[PDB]
Design an enzyme around this catalytic site. Structure first.
Site, PDB file in Angstrom:
ATOM      1  N   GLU A  63       0.812  -1.212   0.000  1.00 57.05           N
ATOM      2  CA  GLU A  63       0.000   0.000   0.000  1.00 57.05           C
ATOM      3  C   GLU A  63       0.846   1.263   0.000  1.00 57.05           C
ATOM      4  N   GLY A  82      -6.169   5.190  -1.452  1.00 59.87           N
ATOM      5  CA  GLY A  82      -6.471   3.783  -1.645  1.00 59.87           C
ATOM      6  C   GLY A  82      -7.904   3.432  -1.288  1.00 59.87           C
ATOM      7  N   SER A 109      -8.175   8.695 -15.383  1.00 62.82           N
ATOM      8  CA  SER A 109      -8.273  10.088 -15.008  1.00 62.82           C
ATOM      9  C   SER A 109      -8.907  10.171 -13.636  1.00 62.82           C
ATOM     10  N   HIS A 111      -9.369   6.940 -11.521  1.00 64.04           N
ATOM     11  CA  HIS A 111      -8.886   5.875 -10.656  1.00 64.04           C
ATOM     12  C   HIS A 111      -7.708   5.161 -11.297  1.00 64.04           C
TER      13      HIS A 111
HETATM   14  C1  UOQ Z   1     -32.569  -2.659 -13.060  1.00 61.78           C
HETATM   15  C2  UOQ Z   1     -32.494  -4.147 -13.052  1.00 61.78           C
HETATM   16  C3  UOQ Z   1     -31.624  -4.747 -14.139  1.00 61.78           C
HETATM   17  C4  UOQ Z   1     -30.405  -3.917 -14.545  1.00 61.78           C
HETATM   18  C5  UOQ Z   1     -29.272  -3.806 -13.521  1.00 61.78           C
HETATM   19  C6  UOQ Z   1     -27.971  -4.469 -13.887  1.00 61.78           C
HETATM   20  C7  UOQ Z   1     -26.752  -3.542 -13.983  1.00 61.78           C
HETATM   21  C8  UOQ Z   1     -25.357  -4.207 -14.050  1.00 61.78           C
HETATM   22  C9  UOQ Z   1     -24.191  -3.332 -13.551  1.00 61.78           C
HETATM   23  C10 UOQ Z   1     -23.016  -3.194 -14.495  1.00 61.78           C
HETATM   24  O1  UOQ Z   1     -22.426  -4.408 -14.649  1.00 61.78           O
HETATM   25  C11 UOQ Z   1     -22.075  -2.187 -14.005  1.00 61.78           C
HETATM   26  S1  UOQ Z   1     -21.375  -1.200 -15.314  1.00 61.78           S
HETATM   27  C12 UOQ Z   1     -20.367  -2.373 -16.169  1.00 61.78           C
HETATM   28  C13 UOQ Z   1     -19.020  -2.716 -15.476  1.00 61.78           C
HETATM   29  N1  UOQ Z   1     -18.225  -1.578 -15.171  1.00 61.78           N
HETATM   30  C14 UOQ Z   1     -17.776  -0.845 -16.313  1.00 61.78           C
HETATM   31  O2  UOQ Z   1     -18.051  -1.210 -17.450  1.00 61.78           O
HETATM   32  C15 UOQ Z   1     -16.924   0.398 -16.128  1.00 61.78           C
HETATM   33  C16 UOQ Z   1     -15.643   0.386 -16.923  1.00 61.78           C
HETATM   34  N2  UOQ Z   1     -14.711   1.343 -16.443  1.00 61.78           N
HETATM   35  C17 UOQ Z   1     -14.776   2.703 -16.908  1.00 61.78           C
HETATM   36  O3  UOQ Z   1     -15.587   3.059 -17.693  1.00 61.78           O
HETATM   37  C18 UOQ Z   1     -13.721   3.699 -16.315  1.00 61.78           C
HETATM   38  O4  UOQ Z   1     -12.615   3.000 -15.652  1.00 61.78           O
HETATM   39  C19 UOQ Z   1     -14.426   4.746 -15.258  1.00 61.78           C
HETATM   40  C20 UOQ Z   1     -15.461   5.530 -15.997  1.00 61.78           C
HETATM   41  C21 UOQ Z   1     -15.101   3.885 -14.088  1.00 61.78           C
HETATM   42  C22 UOQ Z   1     -13.344   5.667 -14.747  1.00 61.78           C
HETATM   43  O5  UOQ Z   1     -12.597   6.268 -15.758  1.00 61.78           O
HETATM   44  P1  UOQ Z   1     -11.026   6.402 -15.687  1.00 61.78           P
HETATM   45  O6  UOQ Z   1     -10.694   7.875 -15.767  1.00 61.78           O
HETATM   46  O7  UOQ Z   1     -10.489   5.945 -14.340  1.00 61.78           O
HETATM   47  O8  UOQ Z   1     -10.351   5.636 -16.907  1.00 61.78           O
HETATM   48  P2  UOQ Z   1     -10.149   6.392 -18.249  1.00 61.78           P
HETATM   49  O9  UOQ Z   1      -9.176   7.547 -18.027  1.00 61.78           O
HETATM   50  O10 UOQ Z   1      -9.571   5.470 -19.266  1.00 61.78           O
HETATM   51  O11 UOQ Z   1     -11.498   6.975 -18.763  1.00 61.78           O
HETATM   52  C23 UOQ Z   1     -11.841   8.228 -18.350  1.00 61.78           C
HETATM   53  C24 UOQ Z   1     -12.971   9.010 -19.018  1.00 61.78           C
HETATM   54  O12 UOQ Z   1     -13.053  10.285 -18.458  1.00 61.78           O
HETATM   55  C25 UOQ Z   1     -13.514  11.143 -19.515  1.00 61.78           C
HETATM   56  N3  UOQ Z   1     -14.758  11.802 -19.151  1.00 61.78           N
HETATM   57  C26 UOQ Z   1     -15.099  12.197 -17.931  1.00 61.78           C
HETATM   58  N4  UOQ Z   1     -16.347  12.765 -18.002  1.00 61.78           N
HETATM   59  C27 UOQ Z   1     -16.795  12.724 -19.293  1.00 61.78           C
HETATM   60  C28 UOQ Z   1     -17.973  13.144 -19.964  1.00 61.78           C
HETATM   61  N5  UOQ Z   1     -19.019  13.776 -19.252  1.00 61.78           N
HETATM   62  N6  UOQ Z   1     -18.096  12.939 -21.290  1.00 61.78           N
HETATM   63  C29 UOQ Z   1     -17.104  12.334 -21.978  1.00 61.78           C
HETATM   64  N7  UOQ Z   1     -15.982  11.929 -21.385  1.00 61.78           N
HETATM   65  C30 UOQ Z   1     -15.792  12.109 -20.033  1.00 61.78           C
HETATM   66  C31 UOQ Z   1     -13.540  10.264 -20.757  1.00 61.78           C
HETATM   67  O13 UOQ Z   1     -13.039  10.937 -21.876  1.00 61.78           O
HETATM   68  C32 UOQ Z   1     -12.740   9.154 -20.423  1.00 61.78           C
HETATM   69  O14 UOQ Z   1     -11.348   9.478 -20.679  1.00 61.78           O
HETATM   70  P3  UOQ Z   1     -10.526   8.725 -21.803  1.00 61.78           P
HETATM   71  O15 UOQ Z   1     -11.466   8.218 -22.879  1.00 61.78           O
HETATM   72  O16 UOQ Z   1      -9.540   9.677 -22.388  1.00 61.78           O
HETATM   73  O17 UOQ Z   1      -9.773   7.557 -21.198  1.00 61.78           O
HETATM   74  C1  UOQ Z   2       8.569   7.153   2.678  1.00 58.52           C
HETATM   75  C2  UOQ Z   2       7.364   8.013   2.896  1.00 58.52           C
HETATM   76  C3  UOQ Z   2       6.382   8.160   1.744  1.00 58.52           C
HETATM   77  C4  UOQ Z   2       4.911   8.228   2.137  1.00 58.52           C
HETATM   78  C5  UOQ Z   2       4.141   6.900   2.225  1.00 58.52           C
HETATM   79  C6  UOQ Z   2       2.748   6.918   2.821  1.00 58.52           C
HETATM   80  C7  UOQ Z   2       1.706   5.979   2.188  1.00 58.52           C
HETATM   81  C8  UOQ Z   2       0.212   6.134   2.562  1.00 58.52           C
HETATM   82  C9  UOQ Z   2      -0.440   4.926   3.271  1.00 58.52           C
HETATM   83  C10 UOQ Z   2      -1.784   4.463   2.737  1.00 58.52           C
HETATM   84  O1  UOQ Z   2      -2.662   4.428   3.777  1.00 58.52           O
HETATM   85  C11 UOQ Z   2      -2.249   5.401   1.717  1.00 58.52           C
HETATM   86  S1  UOQ Z   2      -4.025   5.626   1.620  1.00 58.52           S
HETATM   87  C12 UOQ Z   2      -4.797   4.043   1.733  1.00 58.52           C
HETATM   88  C13 UOQ Z   2      -6.001   3.898   2.704  1.00 58.52           C
HETATM   89  N1  UOQ Z   2      -7.242   4.468   2.284  1.00 58.52           N
HETATM   90  C14 UOQ Z   2      -8.089   5.189   3.188  1.00 58.52           C
HETATM   91  O2  UOQ Z   2      -7.781   5.350   4.359  1.00 58.52           O
HETATM   92  C15 UOQ Z   2      -9.396   5.773   2.666  1.00 58.52           C
HETATM   93  C16 UOQ Z   2     -10.618   5.794   3.569  1.00 58.52           C
HETATM   94  N2  UOQ Z   2     -11.792   5.970   2.767  1.00 58.52           N
HETATM   95  C17 UOQ Z   2     -12.415   7.251   2.659  1.00 58.52           C
HETATM   96  O3  UOQ Z   2     -11.980   8.171   3.255  1.00 58.52           O
HETATM   97  C18 UOQ Z   2     -13.661   7.375   1.713  1.00 58.52           C
HETATM   98  O4  UOQ Z   2     -14.355   6.102   1.436  1.00 58.52           O
HETATM   99  C19 UOQ Z   2     -13.155   7.927   0.250  1.00 58.52           C
HETATM  100  C20 UOQ Z   2     -12.622   9.309   0.406  1.00 58.52           C
HETATM  101  C21 UOQ Z   2     -11.979   6.977  -0.253  1.00 58.52           C
HETATM  102  C22 UOQ Z   2     -14.298   7.845  -0.740  1.00 58.52           C
HETATM  103  O5  UOQ Z   2     -14.768   9.035  -1.302  1.00 58.52           O
HETATM  104  P1  UOQ Z   2     -16.243   9.462  -0.973  1.00 58.52           P
HETATM  105  O6  UOQ Z   2     -17.067   9.492  -2.234  1.00 58.52           O
HETATM  106  O7  UOQ Z   2     -16.837   8.385  -0.071  1.00 58.52           O
HETATM  107  O8  UOQ Z   2     -16.270  10.874  -0.236  1.00 58.52           O
HETATM  108  P2  UOQ Z   2     -16.994  11.145   1.109  1.00 58.52           P
HETATM  109  O9  UOQ Z   2     -18.394  11.704   0.856  1.00 58.52           O
HETATM  110  O10 UOQ Z   2     -17.071   9.924   1.956  1.00 58.52           O
HETATM  111  O11 UOQ Z   2     -16.188  12.222   1.879  1.00 58.52           O
HETATM  112  C23 UOQ Z   2     -15.812  13.395   1.306  1.00 58.52           C
HETATM  113  C24 UOQ Z   2     -14.692  14.070   2.084  1.00 58.52           C
HETATM  114  O12 UOQ Z   2     -14.742  13.483   3.342  1.00 58.52           O
HETATM  115  C25 UOQ Z   2     -13.396  13.238   3.766  1.00 58.52           C
HETATM  116  N3  UOQ Z   2     -13.136  14.080   4.924  1.00 58.52           N
HETATM  117  C26 UOQ Z   2     -14.060  14.755   5.599  1.00 58.52           C
HETATM  118  N4  UOQ Z   2     -13.441  15.435   6.611  1.00 58.52           N
HETATM  119  C27 UOQ Z   2     -12.099  15.179   6.571  1.00 58.52           C
HETATM  120  C28 UOQ Z   2     -10.979  15.586   7.342  1.00 58.52           C
HETATM  121  N5  UOQ Z   2     -11.149  16.461   8.438  1.00 58.52           N
HETATM  122  N6  UOQ Z   2      -9.751  15.129   7.021  1.00 58.52           N
HETATM  123  C29 UOQ Z   2      -9.586  14.288   5.973  1.00 58.52           C
HETATM  124  N7  UOQ Z   2     -10.612  13.883   5.226  1.00 58.52           N
HETATM  125  C30 UOQ Z   2     -11.890  14.318   5.497  1.00 58.52           C
HETATM  126  C31 UOQ Z   2     -12.536  13.468   2.530  1.00 58.52           C
HETATM  127  O13 UOQ Z   2     -11.792  12.328   2.214  1.00 58.52           O
HETATM  128  C32 UOQ Z   2     -13.424  13.796   1.476  1.00 58.52           C
HETATM  129  O14 UOQ Z   2     -13.525  12.701   0.522  1.00 58.52           O
HETATM  130  P3  UOQ Z   2     -13.627  12.935  -1.047  1.00 58.52           P
HETATM  131  O15 UOQ Z   2     -12.979  14.240  -1.451  1.00 58.52           O
HETATM  132  O16 UOQ Z   2     -12.923  11.825  -1.736  1.00 58.52           O
HETATM  133  O17 UOQ Z   2     -15.069  12.936  -1.507  1.00 58.52           O
END
Ligand code: UOQ
Ligand code: UOQ
Ligand code: UOQ
Ligand code: UOQ
Ligand code: CL
Lengths: 136, 136
Positions: A63, A82, A109, A111
């Site tokens: 990590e 993380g 972009s 994750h």
């Molecule tokens: C109701 C009952 C029945 C139905 C229910 C059943 C449902 C089943 C559930 C299903 O299996 C779940 S679903 C199925 C399973 N899960 C999947 O299929 C998910 C696959 N993973 C991904 O798509 C990406 O990793 C993430 C998008 C997650 C992150 O993206 P990431 O940044 O970490 O990766 P990345 O950087 O490659 O792509 C980034 C994007 O950000 C940009 N951008 C941002 N905003 C916009 C915008 N408004 N408009 C346009 N673009 C936008 C995009 O340009 C694009 O950038 P690039 O093209 O240059 O790369």
């Molecule tokens: C040799 C030396 C080099 C150095 C090496 C050191 C290595 C580091 C070690 C390792 O632990 C690295 S790390 C590996 C371990 N990983 C973890 O520990 C993660 C734990 N998980 C979470 O926190 C949530 O699920 C997420 C924020 C992830 C989800 O996002 P989300 O959609 O659930 O957002 P959410 O609505 O819950 O909250 C929003 C805001 O609330 C948080 N906030 C509020 N107040 C404070 C405050 N006072 N101070 C700090 N934080 C505060 C903010 O994080 C902010 O989050 P976002 O901006 O992202 O929205």
């Protein structure tokens, strides 16, 4: 070259002082164009009761390296955090230092997915891990 | 009760001395008929550089409690080793102690699966993990 930040090993190692990384003597030792590497001793701070490496210590190494690498692939005000980690413990370790090697599986972009392999001093795989980070 | 071995909390804490568990001040605090619990401080030994609990520290805690629980569910010459561990870090911790709560998902003749949840001092979920062990 995957990095967006240019940070040296000395600055990385300076950051660990006074926290868990420093406490476990984790030392970052190499940066490639697409890899990051750090080592960790197998000692009293990282051992199970009977001398083998604690599997949790390997995850601390994974990590740490994966988070740093992820951060280096962001820019400016961006942070990485993380979300998920998994690790397979395939071989034990008992002496010397283990060595973690982190490579990207996906750099998005929003994750990232990192793979970290941890080897013993003879170069044998001991732990294989994946870290999923969010960019915030 | 699920346990096949009778080994007290006092004895467990005694065995952690001189190794990773003792160095992080991880303390076994409760054993139920089917749960096991331990706590860990959030301090310089287990923190990230900017002050929050290191995600690897939580996995140390989870792996420690899971591995002990698994051992207590075997008998005789049987050994238990962690095979795979995974975790989601859902909330950060910054002070006090965190508590891990371990419960069985599967108790088999050759492998086990344990669920360990780690909570901050207010009872809020911080880490949710699963450990798969092998019985050797
Ligand atoms: C109701 C009952 C029945 C139905 C229910 C059943 C449902 C089943 C559930 C299903 O299996 C779940 S679903 C199925 C399973 N899960 C999947 O299929 C998910 C696959 N993973 C991904 O798509 C990406 O990793 C993430 C998008 C997650 C992150 O993206 P990431 O940044 O970490 O990766 P990345 O950087 O490659 O792509 C980034 C994007 O950000 C940009 N951008 C941002 N905003 C916009 C915008 N408004 N408009 C346009 N673009 C936008 C995009 O340009 C694009 O950038 P690039 O093209 O240059 O790369
Ligand atoms: C040799 C030396 C080099 C150095 C090496 C050191 C290595 C580091 C070690 C390792 O632990 C690295 S790390 C590996 C371990 N990983 C973890 O520990 C993660 C734990 N998980 C979470 O926190 C949530 O699920 C997420 C924020 C992830 C989800 O996002 P989300 O959609 O659930 O957002 P959410 O609505 O819950 O909250 C929003 C805001 O609330 C948080 N906030 C509020 N107040 C404070 C405050 N006072 N101070 C700090 N934080 C505060 C903010 O994080 C902010 O989050 P976002 O901006 O992202 O929205
Ligand atoms: C406070 C109170 C106490 C303190 C609490 C703290 C507790 C912390 C515990 C935590 O760290 C969890 S524990 C820490 C994290 N977990 C780990 O580090 C485990 C790493 N993984 C492995 O070792 C292998 O994958 C398996 C052996 C799993 C499978 O084998 P496999 O399917 O991969 O097949 P493979 O052939 O590749 O492997 C051969 C192995 O067989 C031998 N052998 C060893 N032991 C036994 C035995 N009991 N029974 C029988 N045989 C045994 C070994 O020498 C070994 O390597 P060698 O090729 O040289 O023969
Ligand atoms: C590359 C360029 C960067 C540098 C630029 C120059 C900067 C300027 C100065 C220069 O000298 C260099 S910059 C420096 C160079 N180093 C670095 O750069 C490396 C990084 N450093 C670290 O990670 C830190 O050690 C931590 C923040 C994690 C320690 O956090 P931390 O000090 O809070 O660790 P802590 O163990 O305290 O945590 C828990 C708690 O224990 C305490 N407590 C409870 N009871 C008592 C009691 N009776 N008595 C005493 N304490 C007690 C509470 O404080 C409490 O805090 P929380 O409320 O949070 O629980
Ligand atoms: Cl055992």
């Amino acid at each position: 070259m995957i990095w967006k930040r240019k940070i040296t090993l000395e600055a990385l190692n300076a950051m660990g002082e006074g926290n868990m990384v420093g406490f476990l003597d984790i030392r970052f030792e190499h940066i490639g164009d697409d890899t990051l590497e750090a080592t960790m001793p197998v000692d009293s701070r990282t051992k199970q009761p009977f001398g083998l490496l604690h599997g949790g210590a390997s995850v601390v190494l994974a990590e740490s390296i994966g988070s740093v690498a992820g951060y280096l692939c962001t820019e400016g005000e961006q942070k990485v955090v993380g979300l998920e980690i998994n690790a397979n413990h395939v071989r034990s370790a008992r002496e010397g230092r283990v060595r973690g090697v982190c490579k990207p599986l996906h750099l998005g972009s929003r994750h990232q997915v990192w793979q970290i392999e941890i080897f013993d001093e003879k170069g044998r795989l001991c732990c294989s891990s994946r870290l999923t980070t969010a960019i915030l």
